Design a binder for this molecule. Structure first.
Ligand SMILES: OCCCc1n[nH]c2cccc(Nc3c(-c4ncccn4)oc4cnccc34)c12
Length: 264
């Protein structure tokens, strides 16, 4: 029954990048798959946990907007096999090749992402690293949230970090709300086609200020046709006090509502 794939079956091709602890590849195992291997030689007893984390969370996700887990391999190396998505990461589309989606598409990418996240949060999964990087547009129409190496029951993306997270206030800053904030940033990505704080060239500064409250994302930037409601909900997810942020059941319904009024 288990999802351990017997050594020798998984075939490993083009290298395509780094995801949390490990190197990812496109591969073959009953068709195109992605292989994420958090290894060379033999592992750390530190990375042994991050592997056994993602495989333990992913294997609890069965949803269209959560990236599809196919199995795990320990035998030649530690590897997570998931489906393969021809297409790209929402980050790529927005900030490298500069795809230009219609607004209706954007709002959808937003709704799906929200949907996915909602799924996770119901199963008491906390993503802890949602970001345009980890949202996939599968054949450019279906979103699959990916990388659960940090999920919970030398590196940083901070542009998505709630302030409360930017300053380690206690033992767990992470909450369904930090996930919301993270989400609101990719809402702001979608809507502005730009990354936040783009005019400041210094990272350490951005960190400091977004943590103290001096710096917040500039909303006088969301392109002219972005609905009021959506702009309004964006602003709701980005609130600095985490307890003033909407959880995803609400976040979802509110985008599903401004969707039935938009094609007009
Ligand atoms: O940094 C983003 C994390 C990607 C990721 N997390 N966990 C995974 C498990 C299997 C495959 C993964 N990556 C996948 C990538 C990818 N492309 C470029 C850079 C990084 N990843 O593209 C994919 C397409 N379909 C399925 C999985 C992946 C991933």
């Amino acid at each position: 029954d288990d999802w351990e794939i017997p050594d020798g079956q998984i075939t490993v091709g083009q290298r395509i990048g780094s995801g949390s602890f490990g190197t990812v590849y496109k591969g073959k195992w009953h068709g195109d798959v992605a292989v994420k291997m958090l290894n060379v030689t033999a592992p750390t007893p530190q990375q042994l946990q991050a592997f056994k984390n993602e495989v333990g969370v992913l294997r609890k996700t069965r949803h269209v907007n959560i990236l599809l887990f196919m199995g795990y391999s320990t035998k030649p190396q530690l590897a997570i096999v998931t489906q393969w998505c021809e297409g790209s990461s929402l980050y790529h589309h927005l900030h490298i090749i500069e795809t230009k989606f219609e607004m209706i598409k954007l709002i959808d990418i937003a709704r799906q992402t929200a949907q996915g996240m909602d799924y996770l949060h119901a199963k008491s999964i906390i993503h802890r690293d949602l970001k345009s990087n980890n949202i996939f547009l599968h054949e450019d129409l279906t979103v699959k949230i990916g990388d659960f190496g940090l999920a919970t029951v030398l590196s940083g993306s901070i542009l998505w970090m709630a302030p409360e997270v930017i300053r380690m206030q206690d033992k767990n800053p992470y909450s369904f709300q930090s996930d919301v904030y993270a989400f609101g940033i990719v809402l702001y990505e979608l809507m502005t086609g730009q990354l936040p704080y783009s005019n400041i060239n210094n990272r350490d500064q951005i960190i400091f200020m977004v943590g103290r409250g001096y710096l917040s994302p500039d909303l006088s930037k969301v392109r002219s046709n972005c609905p009021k409601a959506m702009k309004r909900l964006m602003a709701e997810c980005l609130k600095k006090k985490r307890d003033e942020r909407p959880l995803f059941p609400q976040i979802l319904a509110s985008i599903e509502l401004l969707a039935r009024s938009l094609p007009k």
